[PDB]
Write a protein that binds this ligand. Structure first.
Ligand SMILES: O=C(O)CCc1nccs1
Length: 330
């Protein structure tokens, strides 16, 4: 089997992407944030505290003839950005782009943090990291991809995120028309439960490529590119007027600037992030100070190849017995 679903930016900045997901019988379609940095499929629901729902579409398990409470199971997750959610668990039929999994754990939110409530466009998350990170207790549950893997034509999914445009998540096949050149594959460590890999270096604009190992994670659920302070300083030094602002929370630059590109290495291959992808616009409405899309990871503990980086590539998440990542230009 295979599946193919379009993923759409939630706003004009590409802050996140939503993909329609069919849950239950008859189908209830929710728009989920596919997140290769986490491993829970959780949804706003009829169980979510009413004051914490503000425009989201909810899953109502009592209206699904295939929903079954997973007795005793609870979940609770906290994300790198400080947001969180928690609740109980059903199993139900879940379909993405024509690919159906029966008995998928659907984690129903009883509580969500304010950042989720305030974002009416995201109805939940669909985690695509390794199932070892799933938070369901006392019996950890499998991700949608893990459940689908054996049925797929090939045990892979691909992320093709658009710049200010829709893109595609495919399951079970590699669309050879969706990228240019070849796909360069690189080794993955699953020791932390992430799609963790080592970039071979970087360049700023037309500058020389610096060969240096940068360990990080491929994370579709993170907006920006978070890299070591040395690398980030070298990037922003090429933008006149750029400065790290403790009060704003990162690097900011004059909105009148033209940003240089940023290249990262994948083995001997190179992925070029155009400068425009690094512009996240005014820090507040009407400001001439703009927020940068490359930021320091120094306070995170891990480097994160988020959407800024991934949207410049066609990315293969190869879930074979020994997983690997692939990157192609597009
Ligand atoms: O604040 C300043 O010093 C000038 C305007 C800028 N905004 C962002 C970076 S420089």
């Amino acid at each position: 089997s295979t599946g193919s679903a379009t993923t759409t930016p939630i706003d004009s900045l590409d802050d996140a992407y939503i993909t329609p997901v069919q849950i239950g019988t008859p189908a209830q379609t929710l728009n989920l944030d596919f997140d290769t940095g986490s491993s829970d499929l959780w949804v706003f629901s009829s169980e979510t505290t009413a004051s914490e729902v503000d425009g989201q579409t909810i899953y109502t398990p009592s209206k699904s003839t295939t929903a079954k409470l997973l007795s005793g199971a609870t979940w609770s997750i906290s994300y790198g950005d400080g947001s969180s959610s928690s609740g109980d668990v059903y199993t139900d039929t879940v379909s993405v782009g024509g690919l159906t999994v029966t008995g998928q754990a659907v984690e129903s939110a009883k509580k969500v943090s304010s950042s989720f409530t305030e974002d009416s466009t995201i109805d939940g998350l669909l985690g695509l990291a390794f199932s070892t990170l799933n938070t369901v207790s006392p019996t950890q549950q499998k991700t949608f991809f893990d459940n689908a893997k054996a049925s797929l034509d090939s045990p892979v999914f691909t992320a093709d995120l658009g710049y200010h445009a829709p893109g595609t998540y495919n399951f079970g096949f590699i669309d050879t028309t969706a990228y240019t050149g070849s796909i360069t594959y690189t080794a993955v460590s699953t020791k932390q439960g992430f799609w963790e890999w080592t970039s071979t270096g970087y360049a700023v604009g037309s500058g020389t490529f610096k060969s240096t190992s940068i360990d990080g994670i491929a994370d579709t659920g993170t907006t920006l590119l978070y890299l070591p302070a040395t690398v980030v300083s070298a990037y922003w030094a090429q933008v006149s007027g750029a400065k790290s602002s403790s009060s704003v929370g990162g690097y900011v630059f004059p909105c009148s600037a033209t940003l240089p590109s940023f290249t990262f290495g994948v083995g001997s291959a190179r992925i070029v992030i155009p400068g425009d992808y690094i512009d996240f616009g005014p820090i507040s409405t009407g400001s001439s100070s703009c927020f940068g899309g490359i930021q320091s990871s120094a306070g995170i503990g891990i480097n994160i190849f988020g959407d800024v980086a991934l949207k410049a590539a066609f990315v293969v998440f190869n879930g074979a017995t020994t997983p690997t990542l692939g990157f192609a230009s597009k």
